[PDB]
């Protein structure tokens, strides 16, 4: 087995050869920089309105591109789509599994996804011939439970699940495209770039990846984390992402860089984190915890700037609209509430 | 809505429409009871949801007794990390847990060193103290008896056990499995656990486990009365 | 595979009393708002009644209020109208309409091919000035239309309904909320307005393009149509 150790050898000695390069690369910090410039205000967020209808724990949403309407997911068997200025129901759809745990809108607004543990992503139709709501198509080449999923145009989506692997879909065929293989751990969450040329994931193995869509090859990868990542999320510009693991952290990381930027902590904060978004402008940081509550970061100085507690349970989902005005989050007490 | 256009009106009474369907639908799954089936390849799972009812990652199971609704979950084909999915079982009705008596002696295929049983018994006590079931009932199940009463005689159980010091006999040998099972549950008094032996019961252990799922209801009831 | 198919009609004694039926195939019935809708002979149309989805509302034409009654059978997929006291004027063509109303819907956007009944023998008033143009192929025209009262409600969309009738043929959906082309509507078509003045605009006029062109406002009940605006060669 002298092959072997020396293979380990190598690839010891060229992670070490990284690690070098980028301590190198490394000069001052983004606190030191970023001192000069004012701190931003006590951020007073309220809740404007109050969604009621899912009768079991909400997993996930979706907004839409058009930042009215969106898309929720409750392990009671039931799809439900907003409308979040007059708090209308627009469509409920009845799952054929009820374990589902994510859920996507398609930016035409015409396909809504969803997955759970039944390792299928049904696409459903919203404009048919008939008054209601059809499933188009179902992908089954998983073999791990769906975590994450995230349409590219209404013929293209990609998908993560639990067999450690990421995958591209041709919806029309139903058919796999590129499969991203490299993690060894779960995949947890996806996160597309603005451009949809790349995109991110993060998985229990503590890293995170950066992929070539065309290309279907593994980039960059990011190791700040000593404990598995639930969220991730692209920075407005295109060129950094922040993730939230479970040692009750978030971390900044940036493509040109290839390295950690700053870390989003607080003593007084233990559990963990179970989504992160950002806003327009991408000056706040907003992450959900297990402790019911979402705070509200400063993403240039790490100092916390608000708190939105309205929950008295787990805050399982965050959603920021395209345009910036409103912010949204789910619970596992089954309601959603819209902060401005 | 005074202030509303006709078109509006007509959504917001659409609206209205769905919230009756989904109230009704929801108090419709209300009555049925959930249990979440759990073990091991070869404990005897496909025996027991085949008597009960006479890659896909859960399997769904179907049935009636004594105009009660129960749906049954299997989890077996999942070979992902089981502490990131185990959170959407909380507020299961009970959990059934299937061990194959017969297994005292065999090794697993996988790892030479571990034997069977105490891969089982570290298993039960993994799900037992899970902090997603401190307050669940547990229905434990003893598959293989007659094999058993069959190996016994052959070969003493003092193999998986080495420190059992008792008769090689069926009936203490037994007493002394279900008593290292139900050794590992640490809350004791918020959960209970329910043992039934079986080999080629027909009809019995079905009612096992209405009488069982009786008592869940009732505590459920009272703590709902207050009288609790 | 929609389709709407109506029964009833035949020569008929002044008071009198029958009840049309339509029946319903191809969709969700059960979804669906459902109107009548009435032409005379050489004349335009006219609102009759509404019954929503689910029956909890309904609403009639002062024309025909306590003569007129509407109900749905859901389970056989039937719509129906019993009319009672028949006189002179509702000798005309019964349709039925379907419409479905949500945030981004498309009322009005199936006409079943109405069966015909002979009898022996303040609203807002929508009008168009002009009751013919003559067209060509390939030429741009404009049609125009004008409301008594201003059809822009406080949330922002302004409610206004173009519809076609083809000679022989029943109404189609052109233009919904003014601006909205309809699902099967070529790109030569717009719309465009200003709270009581609204046009239509044909580009590359084509031999299809030959018929009635009505407007309608859905701001409140009763709901109203235009005159017609006829186009030929």
């Known amino acids: 087995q002298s092959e072997l150790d020396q293979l380990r050898q190598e690839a010891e000695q060229l992670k070490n050869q990284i690690r070098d390069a980028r301590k190198a690369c490394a000069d001052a910090t983004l606190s030191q920089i970023t001192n000069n410039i004012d701190p931003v205000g006590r951020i007073q967020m309220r809740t404007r309105r109050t969604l009621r209808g899912h009768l079991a724990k909400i997993y996930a949403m979706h907004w839409g591109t058009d930042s009215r309407l969106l898309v929720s997911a409750s392990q009671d068997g039931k799809l439900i789509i907003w409308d979040s200025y007059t708090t209308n129901k627009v469509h409920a759809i009845p799952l054929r599994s009820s374990w589902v745990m994510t859920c996507a809108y398609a930016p035409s607004g015409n396909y809504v996804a969803c997955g759970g543990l039944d390792n299928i992503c049904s696409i459903y139709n919203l404009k048919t011939r008939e008054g209601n709501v059809r499933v188009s198509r179902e992908l089954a080449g998983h073999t791990g439970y769906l975590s994450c999923c995230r349409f590219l145009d209404d013929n293209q989506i990609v998908t993560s699940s639990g067999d450690t692997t990421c995958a591209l879909w041709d919806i029309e065929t139903g058919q796999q495209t590129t499969t991203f293989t490299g993690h060894t751990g779960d995949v947890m969450s996806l996160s597309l770039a603005p451009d949809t040329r790349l995109f991110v994931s993060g998985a229990c193995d503590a890293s995170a990846k950066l992929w070539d869509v065309r290309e279907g090859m593994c980039r960059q990868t990011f190791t700040g984390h000593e404990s598995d990542i639930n969220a991730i999320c692209f920075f407005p510009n295109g060129n950094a992402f922040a993730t939230g693991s479970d040692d009750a952290t978030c971390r900044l990381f940036d493509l040109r860089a290839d390295q950690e930027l700053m870390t989003y902590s607080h003593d007084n904060i233990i559990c963990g984190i179970t989504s992160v978004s950002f806003s327009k402008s991408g000056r706040l940081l907003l992450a959900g915890y297990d402790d019911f509550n979402c705070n509200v970061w400063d993403a240039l100085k790490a100092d916390r700037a608000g708190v939105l507690a309205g929950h008295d349970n787990r805050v399982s989902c965050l959603g920021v609209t395209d345009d910036g005005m409103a912010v949204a989050t789910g619970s596992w007490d089954s309601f959603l509430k819209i902060w401005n | 809505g005074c202030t509303l256009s006709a078109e509006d009106k007509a959504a917001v009474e659409r609206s209205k429409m769905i919230d009756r369907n989904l109230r009704e639908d929801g108090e419709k799954a209300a009555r049925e009871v959930k249990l979440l089936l759990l073990g091991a390849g070869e404990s005897g799972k496909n025996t027991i949801v085949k008597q009960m009812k006479i890659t896909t990652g859960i399997v769904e199971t179907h049935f009636t007794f004594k105009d009660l609704h129960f749906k049954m979950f299997d989890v077996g084909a999942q070979r992902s990390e089981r502490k990131k999915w185990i959170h959407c079982f909380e507020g299961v009705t009970a959990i059934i847990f299937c061990v194959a008596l017969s297994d005292y002696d065999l090794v697993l295929a996988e790892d030479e060193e571990m034997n069977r049983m105490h891969a089982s018994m570290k298993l039960f006590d993994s799900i037992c103290n899970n902090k997603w079931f401190t307050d669940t009932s547990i229905i434990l199940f003893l598959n293989k008896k007659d094999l058993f009463e069959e190996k016994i005689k052959k070969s003493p159980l003092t193999i998986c056990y080495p420190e059992y010091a008792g008769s090689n006999t069926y009936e203490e040998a037994a007493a002394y499995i279900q008593c290292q099972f139900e050794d590992l549950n640490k809350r004791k008094d918020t959960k209970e656990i329910y043992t039934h032996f079986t080999c080629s019961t027909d009809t019995k252990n079905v009612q096992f486990v209405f009488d069982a799922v009786t008592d869940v209801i009732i505590k459920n009831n009272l703590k709902d009365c207050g009288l609790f | 595979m929609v389709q709407l198919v109506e029964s009833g009609g035949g020569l008929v004694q002044p008071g009198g009393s029958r009840k049309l039926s339509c029946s319903a195939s191809?969709?969700?019935?059960?979804?669906?708002?459902m109107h009548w809708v009435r032409q005379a002979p050489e004349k335009g149309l006219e609102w009759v009644a509404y019954?929503?989805?689910?029956?909890?509302?309904?609403y009639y034409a002062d024309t025909v209020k306590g003569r007129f009654t509407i109900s749905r059978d859901d389970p056989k997929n039937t719509l129906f109208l019993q009319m009672t006291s028949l006189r002179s004027e509702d000798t005309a063509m019964y349709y039925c309409?379907?419409?479905?109303?949500?945030?981004?819907?498309?009322?009005?956007?199936?006409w079943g091919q109405g069966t015909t009944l002979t009898v022996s023998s303040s609203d807002i008033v929508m009008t168009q000035a002009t009751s013919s143009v003559p067209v060509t192929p390939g030429e741009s025209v404009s049609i125009s239309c004008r409301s008594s009262?201003?059809?822009?409600?406080?949330?922002?969309?302004?409610?206004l309904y173009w519809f076609l009738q083809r000679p022989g043929q029943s109404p189609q959906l052109l233009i919904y909320?003014?601006?909205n082309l309809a699902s099967g509507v070529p790109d030569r078509f717009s719309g465009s307005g200003s709270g009581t003045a609204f046009t239509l605009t044909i580009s590359r006029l084509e031999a299809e393009d030959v018929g009635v062109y009505y407007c309608?406002?859905?701001?409140?009940?009763?709901?109203?149509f235009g005159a017609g605006t006829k186009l030929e060669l």
């Open positions: 309409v379907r419409s479905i109303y949500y945030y981004g819907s498309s009322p009005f956007d199936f």
């Open positions: 191809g969709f969700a019935f059960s979804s669906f708002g």
């Open positions: 019954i929503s989805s689910g029956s909890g509302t309904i």
């Open positions: 009262k201003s059809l822009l409600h406080s949330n922002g969309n302004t409610y």
């Open positions: 909320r003014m601006s």
């Open positions: 309608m406002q859905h701001l409140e009940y009763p709901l109203t």
